[PDB]
Amino acid sequence: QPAHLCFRSFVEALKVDNDLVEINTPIDPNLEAAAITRRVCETNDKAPLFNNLIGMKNGLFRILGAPGSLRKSSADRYGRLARHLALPPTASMREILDKMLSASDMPPIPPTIVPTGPCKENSLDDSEFDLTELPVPLIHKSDGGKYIQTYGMHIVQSPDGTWTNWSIARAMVHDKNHLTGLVIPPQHIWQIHQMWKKEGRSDVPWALAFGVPPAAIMASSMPIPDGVTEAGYVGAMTGSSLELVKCDTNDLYVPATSEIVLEGTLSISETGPEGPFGEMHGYIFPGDTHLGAKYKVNRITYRNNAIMPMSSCGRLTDETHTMIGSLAAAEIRKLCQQNDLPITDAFAPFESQVTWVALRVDTEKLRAMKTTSEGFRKRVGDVVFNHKAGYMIHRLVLVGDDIDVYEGKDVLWAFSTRCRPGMDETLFEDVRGFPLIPYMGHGNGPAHRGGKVVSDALMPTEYTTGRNWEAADFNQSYPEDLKQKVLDNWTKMGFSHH
Amino acid sequence: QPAHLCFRSFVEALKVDNDLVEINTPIDPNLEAAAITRRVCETNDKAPLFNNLIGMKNGLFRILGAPGSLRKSSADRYGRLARHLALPPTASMREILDKMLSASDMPPIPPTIVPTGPCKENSLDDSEFDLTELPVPLIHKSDGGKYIQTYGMHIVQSPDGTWTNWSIARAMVHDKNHLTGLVIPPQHIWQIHQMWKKEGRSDVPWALAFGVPPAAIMASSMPIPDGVTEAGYVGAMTGSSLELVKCDTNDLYVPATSEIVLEGTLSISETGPEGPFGEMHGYIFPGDTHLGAKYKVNRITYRNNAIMPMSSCGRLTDETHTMIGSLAAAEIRKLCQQNDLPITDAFAPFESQVTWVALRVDTEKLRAMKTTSEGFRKRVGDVVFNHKAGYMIHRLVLVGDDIDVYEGKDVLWAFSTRCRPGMDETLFEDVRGFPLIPYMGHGNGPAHRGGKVVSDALMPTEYTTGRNWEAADFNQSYPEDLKQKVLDNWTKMGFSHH
Ligand SMILES: Cc1cc2c3c(c1C)C(C)(C)CC=[N+]3c1c([nH]c(=O)[nH]c1=O)N2C[C@H](O)[C@H](O)[C@H](O)COP(=O)(O)O
Ligand SMILES: Cc1cc2c3c(c1C)C(C)(C)CC=[N+]3c1c([nH]c(=O)[nH]c1=O)N2C[C@H](O)[C@H](O)[C@H](O)COP(=O)(O)O
Ligand SMILES: [K+]
Ligand SMILES: [K+]
Ligand SMILES: [K+]
Ligand SMILES: [K+]
Ligand SMILES: [Mn+2]
Ligand SMILES: [Mn+2]
C-alpha cells in the first residue's frame, strides 16, 4: 500500500528516507519515550520508532514519535509532511498547503466499505483489556494522566447520519475502560456532541483510530468546513476512495489499515478529570485539572505488531505547530479568497508559536479596491475571527507582495518596521478566543472572548500608487550584473543546498 | 598599541583572528565595495579589507567593511565587538554591555594631550583636496550621495567648553569642501548645535575622525548621558587616559591614531540636500531627499596608508543593529535600575529590527512592589519613552526571569504567548517617536510623535505568588537523571561548540 494510504507503509518510507531511528532496546513509556521524542522535535532529528516499549504485551504496542515534525535540512525540511501526501520530500509549504486545499473545489470521493483489513488481525473484548495495563506514555512530568491519544483520529457521526467527522483532540486514560479528553467549541467533535445531547436519547457512537492513513490524519488536523465528511475530502485529495471497515460493536467505519482501534461511546452526560497537559504553546500549568468529556471503550482491535504514533508536543517544533498552524492558515487563505479579499498566501509563523497568521496581499488588487487600512483591517478581521478557521489565531499580520509569508524572518521584519503600534492595528474583543493560549486561559481577561488583533504591515502607498521603497539588502540595493560578479568572485576573493 | 586603543592594531587583530579577508585587486567604491560588505553582513562572513580601491590617491584611502558585524560561529558570534573592548572573543553580550556600562559609576579619566601622532603623517589644506575626487563609496544604488561618513566620530563641544561630545551620525559629500548629514533631536550633536545657534555668533567648530580607537567608536554609538564627555567615559572604561592631539585649524582634539581627520565647521545657518540613505531598518525610499545640516571641511590629515571604516547598513546584521540596538538597550537597563525598576537585563532583539527592547524583570522584587500590570507598564514606559535612551525604541516587552532576553527566539515565544493583545499593552502617543522607522516617517501618523507601546509578557502570578507553569520542553518537562540518560545514550541509540 502507498505510504500516504497506510501508516505501516509510511513508517517504511521514513526508514528508506534515512529519517527513522529504530530503538530495539527497552524504553520506558513513563517519560523516556516522550523525552527522546521531545529532544528530536527540538533538534529536527530523525523520527524515533520504539520497538521495545516496557509494558508492551500481546502486540500492544510500539510507538512512533515525531510523525509530522521537521527534518534538519532546509531542502527537505517538510519531508515528513510530504510523505503524508505522496508529494516529493522536497515539497515547499505552499505545495503541501495547496495539496491540502485541492479537494475544496472537487466532488468528494466517498469511502469504499471492505469486509476486513489489518486492523482486525487481533481483538480484545471488554473482559480482556485494561487501558491502565497498556504502555500508554506519560508525555510530560506534570501531565494529569497518560495521554494515549495525541495522534489518532476520533470518528463521530451526526445523529441523522449525514456527516461523519474525523479530527484530532487529546485524550488520556481515566480507568480500565474510559478516557477523558478535550471536547470544546467550536470544534466539530463538540458540534456533533451537542447534536446528540439535544436529541437526548443516547451516548455518541464513537471510535478512535490510531495509525490511520497519513493523508487522513492530515485532514483530521485541518478545519475543513462544517458538515463536510473528512473521508470524502481525503478521497478527492488523493484521487482514490479510502477503504474502511465496520467497527465490531457499532456501525462506524474505520480505515482498514488502522494500527489500533478503540470502539465505544462518548457520553452525553458524564465527565471526568482531564489535564493538565503540556500543550502546543509550550506550557503546562501543574495541577490545572478540569472536567472533560468521558469516553467508554468497549472493544480494541489492532494490527499484528501495532504501532501507536505519539506527539511529544510543546515548544518548537512538533505536529502542533507544523500541522495545526499551517493547516489553519491554509483554510484562512481560502476563506479570505472566498470573501473576495485579495490574499494570495497565508502561514502561521513558528516564531509566533502559531498564534499569528501572516496574510500576503495582492496589492494590485488592493489598489483597485480604493480602500484604507482601517476599513481593510476591519473587513479581514471580521471574516477570519468570526469563522471557526480563525479560532486558534489571535493576530493577523497583513503584508504586501514582497514578503514571503513562509519565511518567519521576513514576516518579523515586515511586522516590526511597517505596522505602527496602535494606529495600524484593530483590536477585536467581541470574538471567540482560544483559551489554551496562556494569556487567555491563565491571563488577565476573559478566557473565551477577545484578545485578537489585525496588524496592518502594508505601507500607505500600497493602498494607492504602489510600493515606494527598495530594501537595503544585497538583492535590491545593487544591480544584477554587480551582484553576479560578487557571487562569481566570492570564494576567489577569500569568503565562504542539499 | 592595543587593538581597543588603535584602529590600525584592531585591523591586525582581525587578521590574526582569521576574521579578515584582504582584497588586493581593484575594487570599485561605486557600489562594489558596499555590495561585498552587504553580503558579508547578511552571511556573518569575515570582514573585508579593500587594499586597492579604484580612485585611491596619495594614500586616501583603503576601506574596512563590517567592522562591528557578527561572526558565523555561535561561540565567538560577538568577537568583533569584543575586539573593540579588550574582551575575550568568546565574550557574551551581557559581558560586552556590562563593559560599556562599567564607566557609568566611575570617575571620568580625562584625555591626555600629546604633541603629535600618526594622524598627522599627511595633510591636505583647502587648496589640495576635493571630496568629490576621493574614493568615497556609493553604498546603496538609490542613495542620494556618496556616504563618506558611516563609521567615523563627530567631535563638537558646547560653547562654554564644558562638554565635548563624540557620536556617529551619517554624512555624505555635498561638494569639494562640504558634507551634508543628519543632525536631529534629541541627539547630542543636535543639542550642541542648538547651543551654538542660540548664541548666534559663529558656526560650530567641528572635526570628524575616521578609524578612531575602537573603544571610542563604541562610546560614540552609545547614548551616555547629556553633558558627559565621551572621552573621559572611554578613559574610565578602559582604565587609561586616551591620547589626543589638537586639530591644526581649530582647538578640538582628535585621537592621536585616527586614520583620517576632517577639520572644519558645522553651519548654524546653512543646509543642503541630504539622503536618501539605505538605513538601519532595512529600507531606502528613492528620491526622499530633505535638507540636512551642512559641514565645511577646511583640512584633512591622515595616516600613511589610511583605512576608512564603512558600514554597509540595511537588513540584518550590521553595526546599526549590533551597536545601535545593543548599546541603547544597555543604557535603558541602567536607566530603569536608577528609577528603582526591577530590571536585570535588556536587549534589542535583532528579529525586531532593533525597534523593540526586551526587559527582564526580577520578579521577586516585582512581587514585593504589590502592583499590577497596568500600573507597572505605565511606570516603565514613562521612564523609558520620556528619556533620550528610549528614542529609537518603539516597543518594550516585559518578561520574567525564565527568559534570556539575549535570545530572540525566547523573547518571541514569551511575547507571543504571555502578552494579550490590547489588554496587556499600554500605547504611548504623547512621546517622541523615531522618524526613521518606516511606519513613522513614511506611515499613517505623525512622523515625530507617538507610535510606542509597552507590551507586558509577565503572567498574572508573576505579580503575586510566583510562576505557576513549567515549560513543555526537554529542559523543564523531564527530571534531571532522565535528561542525562537521554543525552548520554543519544549517539548510541542513532541520533546526531566551537
Ligand atoms: C495535530 C494535532 C491537532 C490537535 C491536537 C493535537 C495534535 C497533534 C494534540 C493532541 C497533540 C494536542 C491537542 N490537540 C487538539 C486539537 N484540537 C482540539 O480541539 N483539541 C485538542 O486536544 N488539535 C487540533 C484539531 O485537530 C484541529 O483544530 C482540527 O481542525 C479539528 O477538526 P475539525 O475541524 O473536524 O473539528
Ligand atoms: C553605529 C551607528 C550609529 C548611528 C548611525 C550609524 C552607525 C553605524 C550609520 C551612520 C551607519 C547610520 C546612521 N547613524 C546615525 C546615528 N544617529 C544619528 O543621529 N544619525 C545617524 O545618521 N547613529 C546612532 C548614534 O550614534 C547613537 O544614537 C549615539 O547614541 C549618538 O551619540 P550621542 O548620545 O552622544 O548623541
Ligand atoms: K478535521
Ligand atoms: K501599516
Ligand atoms: K555617544
Ligand atoms: K501579560
Ligand atoms: Mn471536520
Ligand atoms: Mn553624547
Residue numbers in the entry:
A (entry chain A), B (entry chain A): 4 to 499, 503 to 504
From the study:
The prenylated flavin (prFMN)-dependent ferulic acid decarboxylases (Fdc) catalyse reversible non-oxidative (de)carboxylation of a range of acrylic acids with extended conjugation. The final step in the pathway consists of the decarboxylation of 3-methylcrotonic acid, catalysed by an evolved ferulic acid decarboxylase (Fdc) enzyme. Herein, we report on discovery and optimization through directed evolution of Fdc decarboxylation activity with 3-methylcrotonic acid to produce isobutene. Recently, a reversible 1,3-dipolar cycloaddition mechanism was conclusively shown to underpin catalysis in Aspergillus niger Fdc (AnFdc).
To further understand how the architecture of the active site affects the decarboxylation of 3-methylcrotonic acid, corresponding key mutations from TaFdcV were introduced in AnFdc. AnFdc has been established as a model system due to the fact that it readily yields atomic resolution crystal structures. Two variants were studied: AnFdc T395M (AnFdcI) and the triple mutant AnFdc T395M R435P P438W (AnFdcII). The Y394 residue is unaffected in the AnFdcI variant compared to wild-type. As expected, neither AnFdcI nor AnFdcII were active with cinnamic acid, likely due to a clash between the substrate phenyl ring and M395. While binding of crotonic acid in AnFdc wild-type cannot be detected by the UV–Vis spectra over 2-h incubation, both mutants AnFdcI and AnFdcII readily bind the inhibitor, evident from UV–Vis spectra, demonstrating increased selectivity towards smaller substrates.
